[PDB]
Amino acid sequence: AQNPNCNIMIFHPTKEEFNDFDKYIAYMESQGAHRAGLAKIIPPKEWKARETYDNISEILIATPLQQVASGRAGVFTQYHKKKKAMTVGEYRHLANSKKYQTPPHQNFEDLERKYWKNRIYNSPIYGADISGSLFDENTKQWNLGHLGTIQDLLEKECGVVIEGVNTPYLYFGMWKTTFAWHTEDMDLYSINYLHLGEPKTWYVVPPEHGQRLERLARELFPGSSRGCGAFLRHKVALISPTVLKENGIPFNRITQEAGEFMVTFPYGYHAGFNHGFNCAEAINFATPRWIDYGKMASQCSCGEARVTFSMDAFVRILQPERYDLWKRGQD
Numbered sequence: 001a002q003n004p005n006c007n008i009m010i011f012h013p014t015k016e017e018f019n020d021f022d023k024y025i026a027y028m029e030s031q032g033a034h035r036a037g038l039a040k041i042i043p044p045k046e047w048k049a050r051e052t053y054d055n056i057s058e059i060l061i062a063t064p065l066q067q068v069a070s071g072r073a074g075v076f077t078q079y080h081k082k083k084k085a086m087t088v089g090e091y092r093h094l095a096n097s098k099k100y101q102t103p104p105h106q107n108f109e110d111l112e113r114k115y116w117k118n119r120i121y122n123s124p125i126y127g128a129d130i131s132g133s134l135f136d137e138n139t140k141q142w143n144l145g146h147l148g149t150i151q152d153l154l155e156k157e158c159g160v161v162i163e164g165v166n167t168p169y170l171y172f173g174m175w176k177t178t179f180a181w182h183t184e185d186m187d188l189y190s191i192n193y194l195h196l197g198e199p200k201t202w203y204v205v206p207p208e209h210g211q212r213l214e215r216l217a218r219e220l221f222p223g224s225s226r227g228c229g230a231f232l233r234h235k236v237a238l239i240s241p242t243v244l245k246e247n248g249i250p251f252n253r254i255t256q257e258a259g260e261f262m263v264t265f266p267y268g269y270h271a272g273f274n275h276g277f278n279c280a281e282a283i284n285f286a287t288p289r290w291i292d293y294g295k296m297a298s299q300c301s302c303g304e305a306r307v308t309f310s311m312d313a314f315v316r317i318l319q320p321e322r323y324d325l326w327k328r329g330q331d
């Protein structure tokens with residue numbers, strides 16, 4: 001069995017290996033990369049996403065979100081307060097202001113210590129889930145707007161044609177912006193490219209151990225757990241590495257830098273934070289190996305999770321027994 005300790009693997013594809021996306025995902029899996037829940041892919045030196053980032057300032061962040069925390073430094077929830085619209089140039093200036101800028105630090109480990117000590121005492125502002133792409137149309141390799149769609153994958157594997165679309169999303173971050181513990185919708189894969197700026201630190205639980213994280217979360221967030229049998233789908237709960245280690249939960253950590261891709265694998269729980277002003281692009285995707293995970297994915301039906309149009313068909317076809325309850329939670 002490849003990668004039996006479930007370590008995060010780092011890959012360096014050549015330009016020839018970078019041509020065929022599906023083939024390379026399958027290669028990484030042949031080496032056991034999915035056992036970690038997360039892998040890093042460093043593009044060949046010949047590749048670029050686009051020519052420059054000099055002309056992105058006029059992109060609009062229609063609904064910036066202020067992430068307000070409640071709890072204790074290592075075990076907290078966050079809610080998102082909507083703010084007035086602003087451009088990427090305005091948001092960059094805000095991220096660099098004395099109130100929001102990254103503090104002085106020695107190295108990534110010192111900054112990680114500072115994040116977990118101090119996060120709750122501040123409310124950073126995140127531009128999230130902005131439909132769009134920063135890949136040049138002429139970039140033919142690993143262009144996150146030109147991937148095979150999940151609807152086409154389901155149709156290829158199962159024979160059923162379904163409605164829905166699959167497009168990428170942009171994220172603009174600042175110091176302390178936070179992504180809560182979650183798996184993807186329908187336990188899909190994700191891919192994330194860090195286009196520019198400061199790093200992103202990730203934490204991940206191996207898929208084979210995801211239910212250990214779920215049981216700890218029910219203990220640590222007991223009101224939320226009574227409210228909903230899949231409350232991590234709400235994407236609001238944070239648990240620090242120190243608390244995970246105290247409770248024996250298997251996990252790993254890695255820092256992504258600009259120019260690097262990360263892939264999350266089906267049912268890989270992940271969380272993390274941004275180091276300073278940055279911009280990332282991410283999208284969900286599927287492979288044949290995903291179908292079994294889609295069939296078994298938990299679902300929130302309490303009303304909180306609310307998701308895209310295209311998840312309807314995935315539930316309806318893969319989880320017909322659950323469909324009527326889930327759709328009620330959508331309405």
Ligand SMILES: O=C(O)CNC(=O)C(=O)O
Binds near residue numbers: 280
């Ligand atoms: O970068 C972010 O804020 C969140 N991204 C992801 O959860 C992802 O790519 O799966």
Ligand SMILES: [Mg+2]
Binds near residue numbers: 055056058059
């Ligand atoms: Mg612009």
Ligand code: NI
Binds near residue numbers: 182183184190264270
């Ligand atoms: Ni994710």
Ligand SMILES: [Zn+2]
Binds near residue numbers: 228229231233234301
């Ligand atoms: Zn719920």
